[PDB]
Amino acid sequence: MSSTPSNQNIIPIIKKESIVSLFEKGIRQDGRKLTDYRPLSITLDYAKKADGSALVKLGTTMVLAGTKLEIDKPYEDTPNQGNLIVNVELLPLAYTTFEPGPPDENAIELARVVDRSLRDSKALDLTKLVIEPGKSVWTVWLDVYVLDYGGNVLDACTLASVAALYNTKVYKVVGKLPLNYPVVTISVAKVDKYLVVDPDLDEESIMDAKISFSYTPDLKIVGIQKSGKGSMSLQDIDQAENTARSTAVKLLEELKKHLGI
Amino acid sequence: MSSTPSNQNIIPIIKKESIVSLFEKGIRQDGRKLTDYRPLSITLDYAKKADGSALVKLGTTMVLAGTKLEIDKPYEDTPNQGNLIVNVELLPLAYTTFEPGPPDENAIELARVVDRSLRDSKALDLTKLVIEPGKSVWTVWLDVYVLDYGGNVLDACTLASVAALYNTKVYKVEQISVNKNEVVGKLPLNYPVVTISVAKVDKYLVVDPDLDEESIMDAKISFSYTPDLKIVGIQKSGKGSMSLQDIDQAENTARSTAVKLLEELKKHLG
Amino acid sequence: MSSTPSNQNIIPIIKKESIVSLFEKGIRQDGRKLTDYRPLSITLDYAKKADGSALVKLGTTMVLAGTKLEIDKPYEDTPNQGNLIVNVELLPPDENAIELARVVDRSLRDSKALDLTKLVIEPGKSVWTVWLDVYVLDYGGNVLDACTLASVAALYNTKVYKVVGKLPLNYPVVTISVAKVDKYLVVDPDLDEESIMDAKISFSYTPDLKIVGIQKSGKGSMSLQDIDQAENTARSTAVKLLEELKKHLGI
Amino acid sequence: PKLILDDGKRTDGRKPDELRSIKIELGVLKNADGSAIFEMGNTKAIAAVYGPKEMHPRHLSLPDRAVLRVRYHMTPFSTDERKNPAPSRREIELSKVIREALESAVLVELFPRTAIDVFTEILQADAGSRLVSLMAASLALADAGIPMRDLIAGVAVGKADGVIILDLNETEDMWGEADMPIAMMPSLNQVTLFQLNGSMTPDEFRQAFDLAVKGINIIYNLEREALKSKYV
Amino acid sequence: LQVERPKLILDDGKRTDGRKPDELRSIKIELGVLKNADGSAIFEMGNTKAIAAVYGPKEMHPRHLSLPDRAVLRVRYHMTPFSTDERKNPAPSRREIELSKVIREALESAVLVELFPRTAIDVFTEILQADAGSRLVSLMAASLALADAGIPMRDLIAGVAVGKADGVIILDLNETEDMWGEADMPIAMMPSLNQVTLFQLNGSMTPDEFRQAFDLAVKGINIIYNLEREALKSKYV
Amino acid sequence: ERPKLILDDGKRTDGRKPDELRSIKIELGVLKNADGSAIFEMGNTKAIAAVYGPKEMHPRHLSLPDRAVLRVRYHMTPFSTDERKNPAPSRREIELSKVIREALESAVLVELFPRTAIDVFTEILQADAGSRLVSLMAASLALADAGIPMRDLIAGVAVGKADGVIILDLNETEDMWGEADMPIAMMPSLNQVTLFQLNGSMTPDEFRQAFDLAVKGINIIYNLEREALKSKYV
């Protein structure tokens, strides 16, 4: 069943003993500060057969998200909304140890966390996707494909997700999606006694835990997810959201610049 | 998974040798020449609860295919046509390393190769198969069950597939729902289709390869023919490769055999 | 595929021989007779969001069953009756779960204990579907009997809606399992008894003491006489079991 | 439907104590340590055995006896309506019931840490499949020379219009009152498979019990001789 | 969500089930209910009910799935088909696969797994009645079952879901609140060590509302933690 | 309705002559956590391959005593087609993964790494007929980009038949509405055919004509492959 992962990513001791000495002076191994996000690239309309797509390079993490729209029935559960279906996959190509087949647990979590931060944020207004009430409705299939696991894949997933939705052109061409505003997810990792923003692969293999905070432009908290074997203090969570929110200002702006605002 | 098969049963490093010198002299170990098929047999209506069926015994390969017709919706992807669904299963029963469950890879390949050769030859049409357009249609389920893996299973699958479709008795739609007592008539069949597999073993081309020959071959190529000797499907199989001339000549040897095969098939069904 | 169970947990050869000596005086380790059932308990309306539920404690076997009613369409095969679907789950579907579900369903369905024809709202159109989910929370041996006691109890506890009232239930059904251990027949075998037994056979009875379901289980075999006698012991016990069940159901 | 016509004969012209026609054929598959085909009127089954071999995962094996791996599977064209080839709830049940039947006959103690595989396909179904499947299995194991206490012979005894009957046909299974599959090791008089589906009185139970045993002994002779057409 | 109501905080500062914004639902705990289980517990929060079973440290079935220095936790979260209002398919959903992971990781920091290398500790939970807070009720039942199994742990795990209904910060959400409210923030922790074990938010809150709800959960957790310690205590000597 | 595939001058729907290839784009080393990687474009068909170089097999009884095990996968993203495709591996994807593996089985020198596994994974980001070949070629280049010894690069084209007209490198319109579709792949320097399939219908003579047209289309792609790997910095 849901088991402790078996194998595993063995980070060297000396590459962990020295990573902490770098933190002591407020700098990380790639050169960036404890609060710095990795370099962000967004290529809209990469997948040409998708209704809307984004290829996000965040550090060495590469994520591709594509949208596919269809006309379906609204469920027995409110017939005054469209549909949003998020499918995240870690391909046997992204990381050495990864295997083929159905979504895995991390894959399902990534999908579910991105789904919630899109749906509950009212980032995408589903009520406007109704063609005729209780009858025909737009179904938004969002498929997120992680192509290179370089750490902090949740944040890269959200960036590609929002970007793909903004790049989506609806047909029968009519217009873009009924999107209210962009949403960003900021992950803060508790490494030793340090809080670190946008952790990479090595940092993810040495961290106690990580917590992810999702923000709308009004700097309103719209999603929280804690991950990892380890635990955090109340003061760690309190401070992690402070660190997360200050970064959300910067991140929403570089996101807009890339999304053509 | 799609991995290199981790089972060979290990063919003896010396068995391969004896089959290679029995060659050259241009003969095999079951006494046939390099262009001969194994003894064939087809039993129509073997499985009495199928709409149509055939038990094919090709050498020591044994295959059984049955048909089952049902009235369904078509797709709104083109809807003046009926359906063909092919399911081949290499049964745990047929060989020691076979295990039960979902169709395997070889199973799926055999099913798809047979499906293409029936659908693209237009041998089964269709024709037809509409009872009323965009509303109701015949769905043909063809289930091909390999009972004994004796080598060259693809060709045996095709013979049983075609023979079973020819054995199919259709029934009356009467408003709506089917019946039984009123057997309407046969399937919309334009013509029979045969598949001939030629295996490259060492430096020789070998028609209808058996199990021992399949275990030592570099690769095999399968040619599908209609009665007008028109090529209607090709599939290459195996770890190894063939030269352009190997394929060129493989198709010549396959076509000469297609004439012999189509007439033995016809005797078995009219 | 369907393989001989690999995880065995091993039975001490000295333990079995002490259990056999207690049989030799017609008593068991828990103190009961060779024909006695274990202490039974039935708590109706345990799972509150079920249409009807029953928490059954039989010895150290615990079984919970809940019902859920929906309006579906009757199948092509006879549209003049409702639906019963039984799903059993061992909670530590496996093979035993599927078997248990299938044996519970047959003895409920064939006994005509729950009349399906009366579940029709309008013929060939809308019909009542009864979902029966049985959840074995503690495998203490003789789970089949505890599954049937839970199922019937939950059906009798079920309230239908537009609240209207109970299901079209004709009568209760019990199942009695008789294990052949060494050279003895044992009623309501517990965990240790199931681990040392050759085989068990289960008999389902309606209030006639009429046989309405039989199932044999286990690696080993029984003689013809063993079966003949096992049903005779099973039937005598059915009288005792039906009346304790009715007391629990409020008749 | 009327099942026992007013004259004392069945829908297919049989007396209440008569068996359907039977055909048994040994060694039909070449790549199979043992095989057999079993016909019981309109029910057709084929079994294959792959002799004691090594277990694939080590921990799924037993330190002191062989593991039996039995399969019951119905072809998609063996029924009147197309049957889904993916194993149904019925097939999973019957695979276990047939395995447990054979667990008491196959001398598993002789091959510890190994696996014996027995696979059966139903090419035609018409009630009795589970017994035909089991009898095909038994004979296939013998066609492989795997030591066994005794062959397993079996019939489904039953009840139609109050009339206790031997070897049910399809009409009898789906419209009769009771259906009682019984299989046993006839020479050791040990019952190997026993199920009831429907309804019977304690007296009717014991009457049909006796009818099955004599129906069993007839099929048992047909099994022994079928394996004896070696040449004797 | 409809777009203006139904009423969540009523007409005097009282909720749809009669609670003040800072009141817990009724709690019922019962230990060692299953006899063929190394540890077991039933947990009830208002209308939410869960039962957990533990199978003490044991050998792993396939070798390579085990860890050389610590125990493997095998945790399952499942809802019975009759625990919801509409019959729920008993095949594991995407919701159940996610929660099983989230509950496992919660327990990963409490259970002293370094004590039993190369072993497996199994923890199975069933939701018998669902009315919001199930993931937390399930996790607490797991914690209590583990204690009922005598498996060493750093501390028990107590948890509550704080939230927001009509701009009002509320403690321990019911089904109506989870469905029609603005926020749902499950928090669980090890109260004696002041270490957060599980932390999720679904919906929307302001940075300040976050910290006020954060405070309300901590005092709600301290009450639940007291009830847990004393539930295990009865065995009075 | 079936469109006219061949005008009316001997040109195609897209504008090509019967013997012209679509535009080819190749890019090496696009992924960072992968021993080898490549992107291959054939007109509108786009594919990405990653290789994970020789490594230890997870279960011992799935490895081979004398050679490496190839693990090859063909998979289409849900947004590669016009109608969304279910990401679960279809029957088409299971067939092509086997056919692509076996094509690589005669090129990859597996005898050099007994008891190991070589993993190759391909993703189709855009489909427009030829996907299985574009997949296979991306795979071939990725293995080279990883330094795993191979007999020869694999180049491939789908040769076919449209309006009685034998054509080279079919587009989507041509695969869907034409008479024949024949994907051929080979190791061009060793003159050994590695993948050979036909879907549709052809006369024995049209078979040998297309055969020849494929070989010269292959040799063109072969040089585009060679030079793409050869853009050293010389």
Added chain:
Amino acid sequence: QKIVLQPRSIVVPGELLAEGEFQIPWSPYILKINSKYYSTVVGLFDVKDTQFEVIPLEGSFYYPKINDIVIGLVEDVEIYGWVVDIKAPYKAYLPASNLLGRSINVGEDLRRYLDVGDYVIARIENFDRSIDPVLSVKGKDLGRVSNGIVIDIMPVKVPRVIGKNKSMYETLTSKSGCSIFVANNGRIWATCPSRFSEEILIEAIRKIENESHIKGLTDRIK
């Protein structure tokens, strides 16, 4: 009590052989419950002196008895030896040190002495209940096989192919075309010259399998 019910009959599983007590040793082919004796296999009931037994007419698997001489097939080359198929329920293992006569040196087996696919003649040096069969290639004419053809048979007809007082040995070792080494394994190793009047002798070892029950056989062979 002591009655035998059969003369020299073809016997099936579950068939009654005898009543009461005899002094027979344990056999896999005969099961005794209390006082009745039954056949467990489809075989041949034979009575000799006070004793009786069942020669099995079927059996494609080989069952190991210590110090038997089998011809096996190298499936896997281990670090400290070879894994070998000997038609048993269990795969055999030939130690490397047994073959070399010494421990393996630092950089030896590519395969060299035996490879995946090589035939081997070896004796079962050690076997039982707790272990899988261990082999030895030490005796005369043991070790790797380097030509001829290997003929597989049902291991249960091995005694019949050699015949009574090793006589079906030399009636087949001398119309041909030997040495025909009938291994206890159900595998014989033939070494005919021979091109290509041939040792389709192979069909004669087939005719033995078809009629082991028919007598006297050793003369019907011609």
Added chain:
Amino acid sequence: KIVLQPRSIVVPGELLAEGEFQIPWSPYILKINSKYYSTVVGLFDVKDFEVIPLEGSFYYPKINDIVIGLVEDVEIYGWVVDIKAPYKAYLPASNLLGRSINVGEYLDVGDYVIARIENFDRSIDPVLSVKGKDLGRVSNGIVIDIMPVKVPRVIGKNKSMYETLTSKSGCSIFVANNGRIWATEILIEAIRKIENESHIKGLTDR
């Protein structure tokens, strides 16, 4: 007998020379009958012909080589070591000590080790020995991973580069056959520049 190229860039399948040469066995050259082909993206050369691989991120073990490995697992009888190979290496506990184990649970999961491949062939995984000079547990600096192909390139060419990397920054960087150098500021960088600019000569610089 004829050779086709001086020393150009060579691709897999590219014809090198034809006929009767001999010519020992290389994994980078395949010869069927008379024709010789390159099997890798490499560099053609001759002397007394050969292909020097320009690509290859794995290390192929040769007996006697000195590698820097990473301990992945600790067994009851020894240690499992990663050495960038298709095969995992094994360091016997006996070799590390003085020849036996009082059964006790010593370096752990993630410790870098310098060792020599004592034994290796086609039927075994590489066996390591920690006996010789400077061989042991690495406890400091950093391990820079590079393509096992560029090992000889990081040095020269008459030991030239080795003195140039050292006469600008830090100290005794050890170039193991493994494609891994143990350093003792940052250099990742220039060994990432000679790492990627390797194709272009004459070497260097700065």
